[PDB]
């Protein structure tokens, strides 16, 4: 679980050092930035039902062939799994904002997505279409503050970069 | 390897729920009281050299049987490893106090400590006496009640921080 | 040189990752604290002659026995060298405040101090008493502001603990 | 490695002089525009995946002899290695932009690269072409002039940082 | 690591006797039907990707609690390790089918497997369900029965080899 | 270059042994099967033009969405490169039959195709539709003898397994 | 035990590979040669009493000095042990024909023979002389088939090269 | 490494052409005469201990200075390493003879041998004499002209293999 605090602590532990002046300056960075970062976590938590439905709808419209037989999504049971997976991703992006780093994303989303999506054979380009639309629909400042939006675009751009 | 922020999402993940309003309200206090926490860590690591000396020397005076022949702190090599071990234990307490969670203390230090000490023959009643002295020394420095050395800081209350230091040391005594 | 910037870059370099939000959060902490540290470095730079010259006097007042023949500081050339070392230590503390970490202190004065002083028969408590007296004069706010004094005293407590 | 602050100290050490007021004022300008530097860097990192594929595909199209039989980007093993190490060059450039000094780029990546590329038979003419495309892509992303990708950012100038990125990529091309 | 021929000489060594003509009758039959044994090993390894996908996906379909939080196939990392374990178990079965003996499967894969799964918290009953689906999938491909994919081959009898595949899969289930 | 001979020599060399009786038996297997696979290699060599062309339309027919702007194969040059890629794979399947092992496939095409296709945004299902069509279209005996088709479908199934 | 099957599988196991055309082609070599080897093993099994007695006598006729007191074979108990040791070697040659490789010979006699024969002071020339006599005496076709005798002389030449 | 088959496809890869009818024809000769090629290697490996003993015996006898003090085969330790190198070279020739190409011999044994022998002081005048004696004896054993060891085999012409092994050992003398 990479974070500002744990990276600093693990660095000092490996060298066998007490938390020094440089170690406590890093934690001050979280204190200053926690204001905007915890504002974006609230909005996503308060509107995850509407955001997921909008993103998932655009994913299938961009690649309608996924509805065809033999592909990922040829039945109702398979489609409602696609929306569930997007809800998983939007949930762990919400965790990344609270925690303050790519910790939750790297361990529960990106750790083995390369092997799993190949074996079950669901294309990864369709996931990017879901998050690209969410990133482009983000509007400032009707949705969140100017600094909060930058943090939210920071988390989305990491998820997209994983599949690219 | 879990801080106070990551502990919140670990509890929420067990029920597959987004971070609720009540949890986010508790985290805002941590950020508000962040400067108070920073000060605490600073005071400990500045006086860490003499805390481990009061504890180890203080433990010997109340139990003189350790330096007697056949004791576990007899020679210089045994005496040196006693001071190193006391300082390592204090080192992880500062890690737990900085992170706000005790997982780093339990997972990287306290895991298997009892098994190791039993094999080597280190007395348990003496070890918890040294830690109980360290707990008193750490609390004195956090509350700025040390008799000889004072650090000038803005007036405030650290009953929450000093109590937090106490719980981490009580975990060390209970583990061994 | 350990500091806020190198610690996170080294941590990111080992894992083979691009600088993420966790790394940019640490550098943001440096911006907040750089205001206070660079005031303490300016104050010390313009008054290093007075601090160093009074600090050495306190060391010799506490330990008159260094004047005896056969000991360190037994002649006039030796006594000057004692003040010269305290100037070196006060110079690296000025470097530590500018750099922002314990980098310059560790690799230029602390690394081999144990072997050098033992070989040359220089007691370590003579150097300790020099920094304790300097740390005792330090008062607020006549000398520096409230935050600058904390930053300066932090570097001095680091030096003493290595000689303890 | 050395950052912007540490470069000032190393220069003042060679003369055994304290950090003067003139050098300190230069650092104060670095700190004041420190928000721009992170604002620049985030733009490069967020598009790192598409920048490299801009370079490698662009270098091949102008020089089709790379993918012909006997070329150095013929199979999938060579093509994958071309993408892998080309991204490494971009990774170390963001370190140099973040740290504010080119020492990290020279010491850990650029040291001994030229003599290795000769041993493997990698053409130097084609390699510098790929790098020079990366510099053009990064600068256009830094100044926020990318044709198809916009990021919302407060109005201002970034000629200082765009000149910084251009020089760092020029160091790579001049070394090999 | 013993094949069919080594098993014969290992048993006969324990009585310090030469391999008799009667014992050689088993080996002459093994060689005569060797080409049938090569019909089948080629069939399993050609469809290994599909077999493991059926096993793991079917296993979860019957036990929906594995993908709920706290289940042992919840995150992406746990899902990828479950698929990788299904491939290793199938890989070692196709080793024993080729060699004609179960020694390679028993000594390199199933040695200590039960203890490892206990420490990791892997469910023992669900691991049985995954393999039992793999056992039915592999047997269907051996006898050229799978409905969607049919491999062109000359007609023959498949009872001896298909029964052997079932025996190897039952050894895995019985051990764990 | 995995092969019957190279694997046998590599195993014997690693143990520092002379070629023993078991090692010559391995080469004896190559002689018996050489006529079967070299028959398919002579057939594929004369029909690389006709096989590749038919497989190319089969890939695009199942996935017409590649013709739209913004995805792979959106221009005339990109579609031309699509057919060249199938020829490259069908050239190494011809090399694999002659060599007698998956050496040419593993080192040249399989190599690191996983990382390359992710960067250039080339779906792995597009290639599979080309090899699946060719594998099923093959029939006996108007194409080749029964034993040759065993070796030919053996190489096609291996390259498919690498893409899924 | 080293053989065509075990060496082929172990190479595939090391790389984590399914058995492929390279691996199945090696096993095909064992099928072709199993006819010739199995004839030799069945022939030696039914006539092992005559071979051992004839080989053992040739050892002592060439080196009569083994009879003298103080040497190996100076007593009736030690003499019968010599014929018993030759029986073991002829038994494991028979195993090496059935297995198809030098597995039993390396595992069960050649593994630590050199240290054992030095401690008990048994000349390696005496065992060499017994096998040389058997190897040269075997003749075709009255004893075995032309190809079966090739495999038999391959096993005798292997053990002979091990003892000198 | 590369065998006879891989050499054909490597040359045909440099022009990106399918394996031609003429090159395919030359391969069928290699396969058709494959029984003799195995028939030849079996002769060399059955007398490897005898062959390497002639070479060192002959090499020392014509140059008696080697065993004299100051020579490079004086003590037992240098004498043993001489035999170990003689067998290693003869071992790699049999690898090349089995494979049909000299790629294995050059890449794993002949690469950098000349530099090593110069540093170790090994006389290259006597080394090539040792190889030339092995070359003569090995050719005799393939053509079954050995004076004392005769192996009953089917009659035929194998001058193609005799010329081949002489060419492989020629590469050894040329490299050193
Ligand atoms: C960056 C590293 C660095 C340092 C930290 C110092 C370290 C140092 N100081 C001295 C120099 C000296 N230092 C003293 C002074 C003293 N006499 C007393 O009354 C005291 C006990 C003691 C200081 C409190 C003496 C006596 C010498 C002369 C040689 C010696 O060390 O004994 C010397 C010997 C020669 C020299 O001058 O270089 C060294 C290596 N110098 C450096 O360049
Ligand atoms: C590595 C390469 C390799 C192979 C792929 C096999 C191929 C193979 N298998 C058999 C051997 C055989 N295969 C079958 C037919 C069968 N009926 C089925 O549907 C089953 C799959 C199978 C029984 C298990 C039988 C019973 C024979 C012998 C009789 C015959 O069919 O002619 C034969 C001899 C006769 C025949 O052509 O069938 C061959 C060439 N062996 C090899 O060397
Ligand atoms: C030995 C290894 C080997 C291969 C297997 C190929 C792999 C490969 N193919 C392309 C080339 C390409 N391949 C295609 C074709 C496609 N258009 C579509 O509609 C499809 C979805 C997609 C694949 C089926 C495209 C779009 C490119 C251009 C990408 C580029 O130029 O970077 C390129 C880029 C180089 C270039 O041609 O300019 C490479 C490395 N080449 C080799 O030599
Ligand atoms: C398993 C490993 C393996 C071997 C060890 C040999 C075994 C072997 N030897 C020959 C038989 C042969 N004997 C030779 C060779 C020779 N020409 C002479 O005059 C010399 C006496 C002799 C030198 C050795 C020839 C020419 C053949 C091959 C048949 C041919 O090409 O005409 C044959 C073919 C016919 C037969 O079965 O007898 C085989 C299979 N090949 C193998 O597959
Ligand atoms: C916490 C980690 C976590 C993730 C990050 C994802 C990752 C993930 N995806 C799937 C796998 C799946 N998810 C889908 C969804 C899809 N079908 C479609 O219509 C689309 C193309 C596609 C998503 C875009 C389906 C249907 C499966 C099962 C495979 C299948 O039936 O084809 C599975 C296996 C479980 C299952 O069978 O659903 C997992 C773990 N889910 C998680 O739990
Ligand atoms: C990176 C380095 C770094 C630190 C180490 C802290 C230092 C720090 N602490 C506080 C802030 C404060 N400091 C304290 C707390 C304390 N006062 C006491 O009597 C105790 C000894 C101590 C706690 C153990 C109080 C009461 C405040 C005021 C606000 C608050 O409650 O945190 C402030 C704000 C202004 C001030 O009061 O000075 C700062 C800068 N922050 C930093 O930037
Ligand atoms: C945690 C990491 C971190 C970042 C990612 C940045 C984020 C950031 N950017 C700016 C904002 C700014 N930064 C820039 C730079 C730019 N203007 C341009 O024309 C370009 C498009 C762009 C560089 C790519 C400028 C000119 C400002 C305005 C104020 C300033 O100079 O800082 C500011 C200050 C005002 C604001 O909140 O908007 C901040 C905090 N800094 C950080 O602390
Ligand atoms: C010697 C041969 C050999 C094997 C057979 C395995 C042995 C093995 N099993 C596991 C351990 C594991 N095996 C699985 C797979 C499963 N998930 C489930 O819920 C199922 C019940 C179960 C089989 C279907 C998983 C996911 C773990 C780790 C448990 C966890 O992460 O929660 C691990 C630890 C690594 C890991 O997979 O995470 C290993 C090495 N690998 C080998 O090299
Ligand atoms: C794995 C298979 C296997 C072997 C290869 C032998 C190995 C072996 N050889 C001897 C040892 C012996 N071997 C011989 C035989 C000989 N008489 C002579 O005059 C010569 C030295 C030689 C002619 C060939 C004799 C005489 C002994 C007994 C000597 C002793 O025990 O001191 C012994 C000790 C006593 C014994 O049991 O014989 C053993 C264990 N036994 C095995 O189980
Ligand atoms: C695969 C490649 C390969 C080889 C070909 C050799 C390469 C090699 N040659 C020597 C080095 C040597 N080379 C020889 C041999 C000779 N000296 C003479 O007097 C003769 C002219 C000549 C015999 C032809 C000797 C004797 C040594 C060792 C020198 C010594 O023992 O002091 C050594 C040093 C180790 C040693 O032999 O002690 C090595 C590794 N070994 C390998 O693994
Ligand atoms: C006679 C030998 C000897 C000792 C030493 C003591 C050790 C000791 N000092 C303590 C603990 C302690 N130790 C220090 C540190 C110390 N005090 C200061 O005022 C400053 C600045 C210090 C620099 C050295 C402090 C500040 C405390 C907290 C005050 C207290 O509880 O006594 C405690 C309380 C811990 C406990 O009871 O569990 C004891 C008993 N015992 C012995 O047998
Ligand atoms: C067919 C093979 C092929 C290519 C690939 C290009 C490669 C290429 N495109 C460039 C130019 C270039 N390309 C990009 C990236 C790209 N453009 C954008 O504006 C956005 C948002 C992008 C995301 C994909 C940028 C940012 C630039 C810099 C200028 C620009 O903004 O366009 C440059 C750099 C200029 C130079 O160094 O000479 C070249 C040559 N040409 C080829 O032959
Ligand atoms: C998607 C996973 C899945 C299932 C299916 C079931 C799980 C399942 N797999 C089965 C059934 C099953 N399914 C396949 C695969 C399938 N069949 C073919 O004829 C070919 C070639 C196929 C690829 C298209 C095979 C090979 C079997 C085993 C043969 C059998 O039916 O007994 C069976 C019956 C026997 C067994 O294997 O245990 C079950 C219970 N649930 C799921 O979620
Ligand atoms: C006193 C030191 C000494 C020796 C010992 C030999 C060593 C020796 N043997 C050779 C090579 C050689 N070796 C054999 C094998 C031969 N046939 C058999 O059936 C068996 C078992 C054989 C072992 C003797 C043959 C047939 C030849 C070629 C003919 C020849 O001996 O010249 C050659 C000729 C190669 C050359 O000169 O380049 C030499 C020098 N001569 C010496 O100077």
From TrEMBL, chains A, C, F, G:
Positions annotated to bind (2R,3E)-phycoerythrobilin 3: 43, 137
Query: Where does the record say this protein resides?
Result: Plastid, Chloroplast thylakoid membrane
Q: Where does (2R,3E)-phycoerythrobilin 9 bind?
A: 137, 142
Give me the residues that bind (2R,3E)-phycoerythrobilin 7, please.
81, 84-85, 127
Q: Which residues does (2R,3E)-phycoerythrobilin 2 bind? A: 43, 47, 137, 142-143
Record: residues binding (2R,3E)-phycoerythrobilin 8? 84-85
Which residues of this UniProt protein bind (2R,3E)-phycoerythrobilin 5?
72, 84
Q: Name one GO biological process term.
A: photosynthesis
Q: Which domain of life is it from?
A: Eukaryota
Any one GO CC term of this protein is: phycobilisome
Which UniProt key words apply to this protein? Antenna complex, Bile pigment, Chloroplast, Chromophore, Electron transport, Membrane, Photosynthesis, Phycobilisome, Plastid, Thylakoid, Transport
* Sites where the protein binds (2R,3E)-phycocyanobilin: 82
Gene3D superfamilies given for it? Phycocyanins (1.10.490.20)
Binding positions for (2R,3E)-phycoerythrobilin 6 per the UniProt entry = 78, 81, 84
**One family name in Pfam for this protein:** Phycobilisome
Q: Which residues bind (2R,3E)-phycoerythrobilin 4?
A: 43, 139, 142-143
Membrane topology, as annotated, equals:
Peripheral membrane protein
What is the predominant subcellular site recorded for this chain?
Answer: plastid
Q: Which family does it belong to?
A: Belongs to the phycobiliprotein family.
User: What is the name listed in the Swiss-Prot or TrEMBL entry for this protein?
Assistant: R-phycoerythrin class I alpha subunit
Q: Which organism is it from?
A: Schizymenia dubyi
The taxonomic lineage of its organism, from the top, reads: Eukaryota, Rhodophyta, Florideophyceae, Rhodymeniophycidae, Nemastomatales
UniProtKB/TrEMBL annotation, chains B, D, E, H:
Q: Which residues bind phycourobilin 2?
A: 50, 129, 148
Residues given in the record as (2R,3E)-phycocyanobilin 1 binding sites: 35, 39, 158
- N4-methylasparagine occurs at 72
Q: Which residues bind (2R,3E)-phycoerythrobilin 5?
A: 72-73, 77-78, 84, 117
Which residues of this UniProt protein bind phycourobilin 6? 62, 129, 136, 147
Q: Name one GO biological process term.
A: photosynthesis
Chain positions recorded as phycourobilin 5 binding sites: 61, 136, 147-148
What Pfam families has UniProt attached to this entry? Phycobilisome
Indicate whether Transport appears among the record's keywords. yes
Supply the CDD domains for this chain: PE_beta-like
Q: Where does phycourobilin 1 bind?
A: 50, 61, 129
Q: What subcellular locations does the record give?
A: Plastid, Chloroplast thylakoid membrane
Q: Which InterPro entries match?
A: Globin-like_sf (IPR009050), Phycobilisome_asu/bsu (IPR012128), Phycobilisome_asu/bsu_sf (IPR038719)
Which residues bind (2R,3E)-phycocyanobilin 2 per the record? 72, 77, 82-88
Positions annotated to bind phycourobilin 4: 61, 129, 148-149
Quick one: which residues bind (2R,3E)-phycoerythrobilin 1? 35, 39, 156
* Cellular component GO terms, alphabetical: chloroplast thylakoid membrane; phycobilisome
Q: What PANTHER family does this protein's entry cite?
A: C-PHYCOCYANIN BETA SUBUNIT, PHYCOBILISOME 32.1 KDA LINKER POLYPEPTIDE, PHYCOCYANIN-ASSOCIATED, ROD 2-RELATED
**Similarity remark:** Belongs to the phycobiliprotein family.
Protein name according to UniProt: R-phycoerythrin class I beta subunit
- What is the native source organism of this protein? Schizymenia dubyi
């Amino acid at each position: 679980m990479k974070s500002v605090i744990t990276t600093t602590i693990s660095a000092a532990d490996a060298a066998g050092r007490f938390p020094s002046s440089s170690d406590l300056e890093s934690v001050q960075g979280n204190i200053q930035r926690a204001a905007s970062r915890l504002e974006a976590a609230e909005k996503l938590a308060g509107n995850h039902e509407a955001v997921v439905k909008e993103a998932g709808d655009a994913c299938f419209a961009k690649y309608p062939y996924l509805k065809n037989p033999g592909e990922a999504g040829d039945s109702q049971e398979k489609i409602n799994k696609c929306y569930r997976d997007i809800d998983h991703y939007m949930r762990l992006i919400n965790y990344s904002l609270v925690v303050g780093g790519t910790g939750p994303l790297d361990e529960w989303c990106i750790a083995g997505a390369r092997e799993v999506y190949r074996a079950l054979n669901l294309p990864g380009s369709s996931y990017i279409a879901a998050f690209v639309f969410t990133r482009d629909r983000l509007c400032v400042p009707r949705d969140m503050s100017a600094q909060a939006a930058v943090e939210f675009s920071g988390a989305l751009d990491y998820v997209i970069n994983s599949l690219c | 390897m879990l801080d106070a922020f990551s502990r919140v999402v670990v509890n929420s993940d067990s029920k597959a729920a987004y971070v609720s309003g009540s949890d986010l309200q508790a985290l805002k206090t941590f950020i508000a009281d962040g400067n108070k926490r920073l000060d605490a860590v600073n005071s400990i690591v500045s006086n860490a050299s003499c805390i481990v000396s009061d504890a180890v020397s203080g433990m010997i005076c109340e139990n003189p049987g350790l330096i007697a022949p056949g004791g576990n702190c007899y020679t210089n090599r045994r005496m040196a490893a006693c001071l190193r071990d006391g300082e390592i234990i204090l080192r992880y307490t500062s890690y737990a106090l900085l992170a706000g969670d005790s997982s780093v203390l339990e997972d990287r230090c306290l895991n298997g400590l009892k098994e190791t000490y039993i094999a080597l023959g280190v007395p348990t009643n003496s070890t918890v006496r040294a830690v109980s002295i360290m707990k008193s020394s750490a609390v004195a420095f956090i509350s700025n009640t040390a008799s000889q050395r004072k650090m000038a800081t803005a007036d405030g209350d650290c009953s929450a921080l000093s109590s937090e230091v106490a719980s981490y040391c009580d975990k060390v005594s209970a583990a061994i």
